[PDB]
UniProtKB/Swiss-Prot annotation, chain A:
Annotated tissue distribution: Ubiquitously expressed.
Annotated compartments: Nucleus; Melanosome; Cytoplasm
Subunit record text: Homodimer. The dimer binds strongly and sequentially to single and double H2A-H2B heterodimers. Interacts with ERCC6; this interaction increases ERCC6 processivity. Interacts with RAD54. Interacts with SETD1A.
Part of the whole protein covered: 73 to 349 of 391
Gene this protein is translated from: NAP1L1
GO-annotated biological processes: DNA replication; nervous system development; nucleosome assembly; positive regulation of cell population proliferation; positive regulation of neural precursor cell proliferation; positive regulation of neurogenesis
UniProt-recorded Gene Ontology molecular function terms: chromatin binding; histone binding; histone chaperone activity; RNA binding
Keywords of this entry: Acetylation, Cytoplasm, Lipoprotein, Methylation, Neurogenesis, Nucleus, Phosphoprotein, Prenylation
Name of the protein in question: Nucleosome assembly protein 1-like 1
Curated annotation (Swiss-Prot), chain B:
Pfam families with a match to the protein in the record: SH3-A_UBE2O (PF23048), SH3-B_UBE2O (PF23043), SH3-C_UBE2O (PF23044), tSH3-B_UBE2O (PF23046), UQ_con (PF00179)
Swiss-Prot/TrEMBL keywords: ATP-binding, Coiled coil, Cytoplasm, Nucleotide-binding, Nucleus, Phosphoprotein, Transferase, Transport, Ubl conjugation, Ubl conjugation pathway
Gene Ontology process terms (BP): positive regulation of BMP signaling pathway; protein K63-linked ubiquitination; protein monoubiquitination; retrograde transport, endosome to Golgi
Reaction equations catalysed: S-ubiquitinyl-[E1 ubiquitin-activating enzyme]-L-cysteine + [acceptor protein]-L-lysine = [E1 ubiquitin-activating enzyme]-L-cysteine + N(6)-monoubiquitinyl-[acceptor protein]-L-lysine
Biological source species: Homo sapiens (Human)
Posttranslational modification: Phosphorylated. Phosphorylation affects subcellular location. Ubiquitinated: autoubiquitinates, possibly affecting its subcellular location.
Residues of the active site: K510 (glycyl thioester intermediate)
Expression by tissue: Predominantly expressed in skeletal muscle and heart.
Name used for this protein in its record: (E3-independent) E2 ubiquitin-conjugating enzyme
Chief site of localization: cytoplasm
PANTHER family, per database record: (E3-INDEPENDENT) E2 UBIQUITIN-CONJUGATING ENZYME
GO MF annotation list: ATP binding; RNA binding; ubiquitin conjugating enzyme activity; ubiquitin protein ligase activity; ubiquitin-protein transferase activity
Regulation of catalytic or functional activity: inhibited by phenylarsine oxide (PAO).
Subcellular location(s) of the protein: Cytoplasm; Nucleus
Length: 230, 648, 240
C-alpha cells in the first residue's frame, strides 16, 4: 500500500530528473551565453597572457603546479611542452548537439608537435541513463574522446626507448633488443584509454571537471594561490 | 660479538619519543618503527634491545654463560601486549597462541582438500561491508583498497567504487558522485585460492579452487608458526572477540643444548641465534652416518647423536640399522667420544624440530618436534597423536702437451662447433703463450694434441695455510666459443667431503671471477689459475662460500673459522692419501716427485701439531681433532710407505 | 611589470565575478521557472503523501527522511517526534524578481496540539554579490543570513524550554522553599529560533557553530531532500 505510493513518487522523481536534465541543458545554454559575455574578459585575459595588449610567464604551467590534481601529472619532460600552453577555453556545445565541453588547449606550436590548436573533447551526461535515472546528479562526464597528436619525431613524451642485450634461444645470436614502452606524462591525458584503465579514466574526468569549473574561470585565483584546491 | 639480530624488538630515538621497532637488515642495523614505519640504519649500541625472534628450529648460544655451547630451539612462548584498534586501551600481558589471524587463509597456510595436501600460494579475498543505510555488499579487495582490513573497521569511499560490488542485502543505493559512503567491515573472506599440491597422503586437483568448491578446504591450523610480530593485526579473544594490534613482545623459548639438557623458560635476551653454524656441529637428534676411510663399509648403518661436548668436539652417537625384514630397527651400539669430523649428516632422514612431515605408504601429517633416543622420529599426527615412528617412511617438507688425452681424464662428449676453428686455435695459441711466459712457481699445466681444448692443471698448497703442501688436480675444457664464456673447470674429488666451501666433490668448482661465485674475453687461463691458487686456497678457507665476511672480526667467525680450518686439514690429509693410491694417468710421475718430500713434510707438521705464529687459525686442537687427525695420519703414512716412498 | 599584469587580471576576475553573480541570479531565475514546472510534480508528491491524490498517505514521511539523514537525525530528539510528524509538507519557495536572493523552507503543519501556526517559514538568504572585502569569497550562492519565526506554544506542550528546580532552607522558618527556572532544552525546533546575530559581530563560538550547522542544514534541505525526497526516504540516498 505505502510501498505503492513510494514507487509512484519514485516515478515522479524520475520525471523530476528528466526536468532537471532539461534544466541543466538550459544551464549549459546560459553557459554559452555567458561564455559570449566572458568573451571580452576572457579575451583580455588571453591577450595579457600572450601580451597582445597591455605576458604572464608559465601562467598555465604555474596553475598546474599549484594544484595537487594537476601538478601530479606534470613530469620533468612535461614542463618543456606544457609551459607552451598559452591559453585555455571551454567551448560549450552548440544547441541541439549532445552536451559536450571542448577543452581548448591551443598549445602555441613550438618544437614538439605540429598541432596548431589542440583539444580534449569530453562528453557530459546530457540526460539520465534509463537504467538508473537517480544517478543523474547533473552533467557528469562519461567519456573523453581525446585528440590525435601529430608528434614531431623525437619528442614523443608518451613513449621511451629501452634496449637490452639478449640472445636468440638455441641459435645464440646476440641482439640489442629495443622496445618502445609507454611513458607516464601529462600528455597521456590527450590520448586517453579507448572507451587500471578505468582508474585513469576516472582521474582524467575529475581533472577535466576541475579544470572546467575552477581552473579556467578562476585561473588568477590559482596562479596567486588565493583560492583553495577543492 | 654483535648484539642485534634479525627481527628483534628495538627501542630508539625516532622522533624524540622512544618508539619500538623491528629490525630487518642485519649487516649481511635496519629498523622499522611501530606506529609509522621508516626503515633506517641505526647504530647497534644506540638501539636498545627488548625482544628476540627466537623462532623454533633456531640454533642459539646462551648470551651470558662463558660456555659457547649451541642448542636448538624446541618451542617458543611469546608474551605480547595488544591494543584495541583505533584506541589506546592496551591489554598486557597476553600469550601469542591465543590470538588469531584476520583472514581465514594466508600465504602458505597448509590446506587439506579432497585427500590432497597443499600450500595456498596465491588467493583472492573479499571484504563484506555494511553501509550506513543498512546495505551489505561484497567488495573485492582490488577495489576495497580504494576505501579510505579487519572486523569492525570504519572506512569512507566515493559511491563509484561500489559500481562492481555485489549487493548481498539491503536497499541498493543510488551511486551518486557528489557524496561518499561510510562503511563498516563485518568480515573478511576468501574468494578463490591457488594451490600447488606438492604431495598427498592419481592426478592433482585444479591449481585454483573457487568458492563453489572452497567449502571442501579445511585448514591445517595445527601447523601454525605464525608467531606474533610487533604490528601483526590479530583477533583478541576475551577471557566476545575483537580486533587488536600487538604493541610489545617478550619471547621465552625452550632450548635443547648440545650437552642434552632441556632448559625451559629461557628469556630470549639471554639467548642469541647462530647465523653460520659449522657443518659438522651436530646437535642432539641429528641423523648422521660414519664417514671414516675404512670403518663401517655397510651403508645401512646410520647414527643419531645424543650429546656433543662443544669444547671437546667429540659427539656421542648411537648406531642403529634397519632390520632386513619388518618395519623394525636393530641397535648396533652406543659408541661415545666420536669425532664429529668422522661423522656426516645422513643424506636422507633429516628431522629438525617442528617440521611438517608426510607418511610414506591413518595419520598423514604432523610436526616433528623431538628426536627419540631410539632414533625414532616423534611425530605423525592425525590429531595430537604423539606416536613415535622411524625414518623408514617419513618425508620432510711450465706448459706441456701430450699426443693423446686419457679417456677417463680431462673432458669428453663435447662436440660443439666453434665460430671459427682457426680463430679458436689462435686463441689457444695465445693461451699457450701466456702460460709458458707465466707459471714460474706453484702452478703448472699440460694439455693434449688430440684435443687442444682439453687441459689438465696441478695446483699446490701455499705455506702457513691449512692447505699447506698437499696436492690438487683439475680437468678443464676450453669452450669452442672461448673466450666468449668462462672455461669448463672440474676438480677431481679423490675425497668424499667438501675440501673447501667452493670446491665440490661432485666436481663443479666455482669462483668469484668466473661469475658462478666477472668473466670477460680479455681474461686468460693464467688469471683463473692464479686466482684458484690465490683464493680457492686462501690462508683461512672459511669465508669464500656465501658472503661470510660479515662474520669477520666476530667471536662466531673466529670459532667457526678455526673449526673449518681443522676439518680442512683432516680432509686434505684424506685427499692426499687417496691421490697417492689412484694418481691419474695424466700426472703419475708428478704426484710422486712432489710427494717424496711434501707428504712427509705434512706428516711431520701434523705430528708437531699433536705436541708459535704459524699463520692460520687452528689452535687449540680439540679431542675430536686429535683422534681424527691421528687416524688419517696413520692411513697417510701407510699409503706413503705402500707407494714405495719411505721416510724422508 | 609582471605583478601589475597579475593585478590587472585580478580586476578582470573581479568583473568576471560580478558577471558570475549575474549568472547565479539567472540560475536562481531558472530555478524559479523550473520550480513553477515542478509545482505540478511537487504538489503531486505532497498530495500523495497526505492522501489528497492516489494506512493513509505516507506516514511520517519527513520525520523518516530526517531520521535517515544523519544531519537531521542528530537533531530530532525523542520528544520532538510527537511534534515533527505533524509536518504536512516541506517546500522551498524562491524569492520573486527584485526581492533579495532568498529561499523559504516553509514547513506546512497540520492543526497540531503544540502550536497554532499553520506554517513555519525559516527563510534563508543568499548573497549573489561579491562583497568588497573579499569578492573572491563568492564561491557561489553562499548562505550567510537567516530569519526564523516565532512559535507560540499551547499550554503544557512546549518542548523548547524545560523547568529546572532548586531548594533552599529558610533560616528563620526552617521551610525548604523551592525555586524554578526555565532553561533551554535540546529540541529540533530550536532550529527555528536561531541566536540573533549582534550587529557588531560579537558572536560567541557557540553562536558561530550553531549558525553554521543551521545554514548547512538549510542548504541540504534545499538541494538534497525536498527535490530528491524519495531517494532519501527509502534509503537509496547515501547521506554520508
Amino acid at each position: 500500500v505505502v510501498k505503492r505510493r513510494v514507487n509512484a513518487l519514485k516515478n515522479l522523481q524520475v520525471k523530476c530528473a528528466q526536468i532537471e536534465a532539461k534544466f541543466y541543458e538550459e544551464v549549459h545554454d546560459l553557459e554559452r551565453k555567458y561564455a559570449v559575455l566572458y568573451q571580452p574578459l576572457f579575451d583580455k585575459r588571453f591577450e595579457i597572457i600572450n601580451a597582445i595588449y597591455e605576458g604572464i610567464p608559465e601562467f598555465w604551467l604555474t596553475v598546474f603546479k599549484n594544484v595537487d590534481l594537476l601538478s601530479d601529472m606534470v613530469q620533468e619532460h612535461d614542463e618543456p611542452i606544457l609551459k607552451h600552453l598559452k591559453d585555455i577555453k571551454v567551448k560549450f556545445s552548440d544547441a541541439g548537439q549532445p552536451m559536450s565541453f571542448v577543452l581548448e588547449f591551443h598549445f602555441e606550436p613550438n618544437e614538439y608537435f605540429t598541432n596548431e590548436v589542440l583539444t580534449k573533447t569530453y562528453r557530459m551526461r546530457s540526460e539520465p541513463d534509463d537504467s538508473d535515472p537517480f544517478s543523474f546528479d547533473g552533467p557528469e562526464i562519461m567519456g573523453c574522446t581525446g585528440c590525435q597528436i601529430d608528434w614531431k619525431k623525437g619528442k614523443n613524451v608518451t613513449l621511451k626507448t629501452i634496449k637490452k642485450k639478449q640472445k636468440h634461444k638455441g641459435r645464440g645470436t646476440v641482439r640489442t633488443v629495443t622496445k618502445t614502452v609507454s611513458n607516464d606524462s601529462f600528455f597521456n591525458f590527450f590520448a586517453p584509454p579507448e572507451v587500471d584503465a578505468e582508474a585513469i579514466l576516472a582521474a582524467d574526468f575529475e581533472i577535466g571537471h576541475f579544470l572546467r569549473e575552477r581552473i579556467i574561470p578562476r585561473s588568477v585565483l590559482y596562479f596567486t594561490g588565493e583560492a583553495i584546491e577543492d | 660479538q654483535r648484539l642485534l639480530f634479525s627481527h628483534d624488538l628495538v627501542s630508539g630515538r625516532y622522533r624524540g619519543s622512544v618508539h619500538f621497532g623491528l629490525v630487518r637488515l642485519i649487516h649481511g642495523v635496519r629498523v622499522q618503527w611501530y606506529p609509522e614505519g621508516v626503515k633506517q640504519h641505526v647504530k647497534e649500541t644506540k638501539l636498545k634491545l627488548e625482544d628476540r625472534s627466537v623462532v623454533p628450529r633456531d640454533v642459539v648460544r646462551h648470551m651470558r654463560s662463558t660456555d659457547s655451547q649451541c642448542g636448538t630451539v624446541i618451542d617458543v612462548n611469546i608474551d605480547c601486549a595488544v591494543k584495541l584498534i583505533g584506541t589506546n586501551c592496551i591489554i598486557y600481558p597476553v600469550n601469542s597462541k591465543d590470538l588469531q589471524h584476520i583472514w581465514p587463509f594466508m600465504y602458505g597456510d597448509y590446506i587439506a582438500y579432497d585427500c590432497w595436501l597443499g600450500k595456498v600460494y596465491d588467493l583472492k579475498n573479499q571484504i563484506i561491508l555494511k553501509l550506513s543505510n543498512g546495505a551489505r555488499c561484497s567488495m573485492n579487495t582490488e577495489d576495497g583498497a580504494k576505501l579510505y582490513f579487519y572486523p569492525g573497521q570504519v572506512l569512507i569511499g566515493p559511491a563509484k567504487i561500489f559500481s562492481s560490488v555485489q549487493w548481498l542485502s539491503g536497499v541498493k543505493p543510488v551511486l551518486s558522485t557528489k557524496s561518499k559512503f561510510r562503511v563498516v567491515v563485518e568480515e573478511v573472506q576468501v574468494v578463490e585460492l591457488k594451490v600447488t599440491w606438492i604431495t598427498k597422503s592419481v592426478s592433482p586437483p585444479p591449481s585454483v579452487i573457487t568458492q563453489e568448491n572452497l567449502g571442501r578446504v579445511k585448514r591445517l591450523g595445527c601447523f601454525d608458526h605464525a608467531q606474533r610480530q610487533l604490528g601483526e593485526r590479530c583477533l583478541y579473544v576475551f577471557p566476545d572477540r575483537v580486533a587488536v594490534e600487538v604493541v610489545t613482545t617478550m619471547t621465552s623459548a625452550d632450548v635443547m643444548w648440545q650437552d642434552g639438557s632441556v632448559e625451559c623458560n629461557i628469556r630470549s635476551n639471554d639467548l642469541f641465534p647462530v647465523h653460520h653454524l659449522d657443518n659438522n656441529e651436530f646437535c642432539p637428534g641429528d641423523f648422521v652416518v660414519d664417514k671414516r676411510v675404512q670403518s663401517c663399509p655397510d651403508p645401512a648403518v646410520y647414527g643419531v647423536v645424543q650429546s656433543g661436548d662443544h669444547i671437546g668436539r667429540t659427539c656421542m652417537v648411537k648406531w642403529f640399522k634397519l632390520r632386513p625384514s619388518g618395519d623394525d630397527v636393530e641397535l648396533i651400539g652406543e659408541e661415545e667420544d666420536v669425532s664429529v669430523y668422522d661423522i656426516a649428516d645422513h643424506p636422507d632422514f633429516r628431522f629438525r624440530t617442528t617440521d611438517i612431515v608426510i607418511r610414506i605408504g591413518e595419520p598423514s601429517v604432523g610436526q616433528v618436534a623431538r628426536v627419540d633416543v631410539s632414533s625414532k622420529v616423534e611425530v605423525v599426527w592425525a590429531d595430537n597423536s604423539k606416536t613415535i615412528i622411524l625414518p623408514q617412511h617419513l618425508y620432510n617438507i711450465v706448459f706441456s702437451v701430450l699426443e693423446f688425452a686419457p679417456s677417463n681424464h680431462s673432458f669428453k662428449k663435447i662436440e660443439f662447433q666453434p665460430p671459427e676453428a682457426k680463430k679458436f686455435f689462435s686463441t689457444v695459441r695465445k693461451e699457450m703463450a701466456l702460460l709458458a711466459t707465466s707459471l714460474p712457481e706453484g702452478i703448472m699445466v699440460k694439455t693434449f694434441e688430440d684435443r687442444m681444448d682439453l687441459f689438465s692443471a696441478l695446483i699446490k698448497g701455499p705455506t702457513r695455510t691449512p692447505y699447506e703442501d698437499g696436492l690438487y688436480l683439475f680437468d678443464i675444457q676450453l669452450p669452442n666459443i672461448y673466450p666468449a664464456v668462462p672455461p669448463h673447470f672440474c676438480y677431481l674429488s679423490q675425497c668424499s667431503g667438501r675440501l673447501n666451501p667452493n670446491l665440490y666433490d661432485n666436481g663443479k668448482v666455482k669462483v668469484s671471477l668466473l661469475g658462478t661465485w666477472r668473466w670477460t674475453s680479455k681474461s686468460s687461463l693464467l688469471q683463473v689459475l692464479i686466482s684458484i691458487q690465490g683464493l680457492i686456497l686462501v690462508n683461512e678457507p672459511y669465508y669464500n662460500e656465501a658472503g661470510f665476511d660479515s662474520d669477520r672480526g666476530l667471536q662466531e667467525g673466529y670459532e667457526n673459522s678455526r673449526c673449518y680450518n681443522e676439518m680442512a686439514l683432516i680432509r686434505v690429509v684424506q685427499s692426499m692419501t687417496q691421490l697417492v693410491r689412484r694418481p691419474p694417468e695424466v700426472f703419475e710421475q708428478e704426484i710422486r716427485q712432489h710427494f717424496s718430500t711434501g707428504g712427509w713434510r705434512l706428516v711431520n707438521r701434523i705430528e708437531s701439531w699433536l705436541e708459535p705464529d704459524i699463520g692460520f687459525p687452528l689452535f687449540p686442537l680439540s679431542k675430536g681433532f686429535i683422534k681424527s687427525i691421528r687416524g688419517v695420519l696413520t692411513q697417510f703414512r701407510a699409503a706413503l710407505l705402500e707407494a714405495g716412498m719411505p721416510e724422508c
